[model samples]
Target: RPWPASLAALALDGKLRTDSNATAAASTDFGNITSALPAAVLYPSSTADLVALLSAANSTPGWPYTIAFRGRGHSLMGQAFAPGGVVVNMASLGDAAAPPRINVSADGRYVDAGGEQVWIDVLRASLARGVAPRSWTDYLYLTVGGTLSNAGISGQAFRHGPQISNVLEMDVITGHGEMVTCSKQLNADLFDAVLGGLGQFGVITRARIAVEPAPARARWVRLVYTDFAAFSADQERLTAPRPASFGPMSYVEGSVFVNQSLATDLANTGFFTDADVARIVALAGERNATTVYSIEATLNYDNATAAAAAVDQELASVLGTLSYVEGFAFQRDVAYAAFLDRVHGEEVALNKLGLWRVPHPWLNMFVPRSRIADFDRGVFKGILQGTDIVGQLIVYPLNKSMWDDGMSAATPSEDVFYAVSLLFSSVAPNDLARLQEQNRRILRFCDLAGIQYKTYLARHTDRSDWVRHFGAAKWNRFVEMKNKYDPKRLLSPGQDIFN
Candidate 1:
């Protein structure tokens, strides 16, 4: 295949790898479910190289090749995969000269951040300068552009808003190869279209993120709740606007474990004493227990002391030292950076367990507060048989005021909502296939039961399914934006939103 002149020039100037097998291999992701092999992989040293490549693709007539940008490729769906297309491996965009800080407002408000920088890098860099990005994902290895492209979320999403809400500006490369900056004031349509745009409108080169003062340390404490009603009530109250509530939990999120899941065995390790195990067994009803992990805000306090105190308080309130492994509670206090990137430790363990390369047929959805009870009854208890099929079942509430409707993807209702994630790693070869079928069945159940929910990282091959996922009204706007920004539909074909 003859390369277009501009692309050839960019490839010749920048470091371009022609290894067909390496290109094909790098094109896929950790999802391990769908396989996409691109013709070649372009490692752009700078935005100019990307711009030139896009220009070449745009100028060439009847060029069937499309372009898809790859970040850390942490997506469970093959949303980042580019099949027989041009894969822009943005990993090389990590530049030492990139500004660690840029005040968007004169009062030293927000800063424009590099797209390739991950959350951990941003946190460490920003904290040294006395500021931090307002929102974060549970996994810090995910790139800034990656999570901003999808709404970057975690327990803090309830308070600070998704990662997209905090962004003030973006430098993106349009389908036409133009390096343009968009914000609420300039290129407003492109600005709104690109956030949660699923990488369709452009490839984000840089972003101006919302910033805040970084916390010194965080106290992560976990509590067990036998009753779902009480657990949800406490969570909702903590997130609510209370006038006289004591310093509420800094990070609030809960998870339900299935007796058969790997987490059950891990949690019952030697760390739990015999009495503690017996109590957990009794409270959890011989089934896995529902546990809530919270980070209590204790500013300028001793990290170790705060952690120990928080754990003691949590245990006293929940268990009253009755039985469950008396000293089995897990408690850790570390730098805020380490606390935010805590999932990395878990990732290392999973990789060691050979679970990292397994097929991940994961499902993440946002459930409206109105239908949460029904969801717990129908989906969690009924369909799951009081046993979880996957790894983590995260359920947390988010305030409605934090979201922006101008974005392509729509949230549930304006009321407080629960974001539910079912993280499953396939143990067997055909596990993902079977799980995918089950996912379809669950989606069908949601539709039949009239539940208001939306997939977080949606991956669908058919336009009809995509439309159904986004609903009719938003789907129209999404199509309009696609036509406006990428009329030729030459970006992120793996997302399958366009023909």
Candidate 2:
């Protein structure tokens, strides 16, 4: 309705849909809270179709529709919704009977994958060739463009950096609809801007990702601690620099288990058995702890005899340097792929229980390392002490050097910061509002405590908040990039940034 002539043309090609089903599917995202009815949705079969849409918007004198590209619709705050605009279902690019969307290099140094391709498929294809990406997110069902847009991160990020840091290059269709290949050495501005650009500049059609030789298996361990200081201190040490052979853990993450729902949360992790939960509960009771912490880490190695022996020695040396509770180190050995794809199994179970499609009022932020203890005191121990949280409370440190401040993704001004993700699921009728209010309180506590933190996977509707998030210098650069790449501010209006 907004662009009748354009809609008619796209409809003829069977790429545009205005039906209830199509519009409804595009109406919201994983948040399941905000809803916006787009006039139409675009299901493009090829990159050319994307070019056509963007090219028209770039050239047209009075383009009326804002455009957003949706990848698995994982946005937590309706950041992918395109109200009254056109939402392009990015997955359609991979749905075509097209040539291989994933191609591993002959020498196995890197991989070229369509931006629409999910990391799970990428991992599958890469593992077939005896290689895999160096960095990853816990959830692999996320599309390459989706995660890269926000800096794909997880336990492994401290070492290889985020997925954005590992990129070799990308084929982006800028706001002008010009297809360009960018890397650190060429079109560097666009490359840096687009990596964590939040889909403001262009659409990522193809991404060249750096890869490494695949490890056959992972020695996974979860070290429990009753003291937050000991837990956090050990985590920082595990992620710190060391010799190559005595290097940091291959993956490192921490979790906070409060007294309320401790058993349920631990059981839901899928990693712990009923017996394990009982033991953890007993430990929590024995310590009389309001909150407990666990450091989740993994070490990768092949199944070769020598390799297995080395992994044991390495894990032992690393563990000796930590401060986890004695007799509380739970271990599991699984295929590397199995460990990476663990969340998918959890998703399947949740889906069967009709819990996967529920609203997720997730709050993820980066707290400066110096203030992480303060965060633990105010948020985990103070504000959220008795709340019945239905999801993971993840906290991990990431080195600032691993991230490029030049990129659009913002972080606290520190050498190290903690990725604190309070992922909450709203299952009960009033849980959504409750969780949102709790999130507000948590933010308020941080603000009043002078915690200079940066929020991730969240939406800020106000101009001032956006500016504060990026700081003055980076905000100005972000504005300049928006003008240079998307002068009309027609891309991802759901973000409510320039628009």
Candidate 3:
């Protein structure tokens, strides 16, 4: 498909590109496995520009013509890619400082952020105001619209829910090219649909997010557990908001770092409490074991020691509850920014090592608590070798009640579910395929066992996989929503749903 003549005017305005290099770049994303060539990439300055591009596609007779919104191109498996369509380069909308104006409410309850802005910018702007959004993604480089279109989940998700739950309203540009403002109280269906709806419902142009007073600093701790059952149970304790009751850790996440990473897993950072030094030295016997599990939790505070101590008693209760060996636990304190952007530090180191830019055979799943133990036995136990799992294996629980039933972001029916993230990278390209085959085996086992699950940052080959994800009722609503909002089935063809 050649560049459409109608949108050629934007190229004059420096907003559209028909050049080969730009189009080729738009063909792939972070996953780096799939490649799709769009006719051109449009860099829109505002929502009006997006509307105009959509309108031209809708009105044109031969709109081979579909559209996709790309932000930072972080999509794994080309969720943001489009074939023979217009790829809207959303970064053209500007970031942190400009276009998506972060307007904090006078009452300090919410902030209206441009959907195209990266979340890191949102953090910067809000922290400047002494406030921040309630929920966040572990990785901050993603665009607001991109994550909300999916569901943004992280350690804090247990307390505040996903980033979707915190949204107050959204300014959406529908497939009909009509710009509409929607919320729970207004245009409610679209509001619910767009959150985690993928790009099927509408393009979220702006979002009003719930905000709260920012904590000045945080204490991050890494507690190790050799027993998978104990490690998982401890995570469940922190995730369940119900009695036992709720525990004090504001942030809780668990990961399996290979014994190979003992330099980091055992002595990763310079900052550690006296307790941490003692624990690492005592837990030396497990050196031969390839798998190591660590429960990471956080306690937030201001400059005051009293504020930090306010939760010390509760944190003590947390440590006592965990079954991890006393000498293996490692706890450290870090500043607020360092804590949130922690993943980037590893990314930097890997980049320097020529490992960061390699192909990522990443697999993330939402498995029901009912089947998590089984999954751990099948997927994590000895099956996932340390050498092949170059990336860490993350396992954490998310409360189901924190998520809404109305949204398209699918999770299990259980009240508590675990998010298992497996990130694998290869310095050699051939190693990528072997890792992907390894992922397939895990999914196949889950499918055979009738262990209900939904994948995040997904890659599915058939509608059966999707049907298994949404079930009958939600799938119908999803189709109906697509029919109503995107009648032509031209929005986000890259998501590879319905059509």
Q: Which candidate is the best by lDDT?
A: 2
Give the backbone clash total of model 3: 2
1-499 in candidate 2: lDDT tens per residue? Answer: 2443553577898898989999999988888888888888999888888888888888787787888889999998877877888899999988756588999999899999999999999999999999999999999999999999999899999888899999999999998888999999999999999988889999999999999999999999999998999999998888876652225489999999989989999998777889989999999999899998999999998879798788888888889988888878888999999999999998998889999899999999999999999999999999998788789999999988899999889989998899999989997868888998999999999999999999998989999999999899999999998888899888888888877
Root-mean-square deviation (CA) per prediction: 4.3, 1.8, 2.9
TM-score winner between candidates 1 and 3: 3
Better of 1 and 2 by TM-score: 2
Residue 245 of model 2: what lDDT? 29
> Against the true structure, what is each candidate's TM-score?
0.87, 0.97, 0.92
Q: After superposition, how far is residue 219 of candidate 1 from its true place, in Å?
A: 1.9
For candidate 2, the TM-score is: 0.97
Deviation in angstroms for 375 in model 2? 0.4
lDDT of 3 by residue, 1-499 (tens): 3444545567778787878988998998877778899888888876778877777666666677678889778887777877887788888777334534667777888988888888888888888888888788888889999999999998988888899999999999998788999998999989988999889877988999998888888878777776778888888877777652456777888887555454454444434454664455345344455556778889877777687676566567778867887655555666787788887787788779887667888889999998987987777664675553466678899998889989888989999998899977765667877788888888889989899888998856689877777888998888888887888888877777855
| Model 1 lDDT on a 0 to 1 scale | 0.72
The parts of candidate 3 lying over 4 Å away from their true place are 1-8, 95-100, 243-245, 258-290
lDDT computed for candidate 3: 0.79
Q: How do the residues 1-499 of candidate 1 rate in per-residue lDDT, one tens digit apiece? A: 5677767786676555667765776666878877777777887777888888777777777778778888888766677866777787877777445533233344456766667767777776677677778778878888888888888987776777789888888999988888999989999889888888888988998998888766667655555555567657666765665562323456667675544443453363223345545655575654444432222221222345455576556645643422323343445456777777778887888889887878888889889988888887776666665444647667888877778888865688757888888777677867666778777878888899999788888677877778877788888888888887787888988787874
What's the residue-level lDDT of 185 in candidate 3? 90
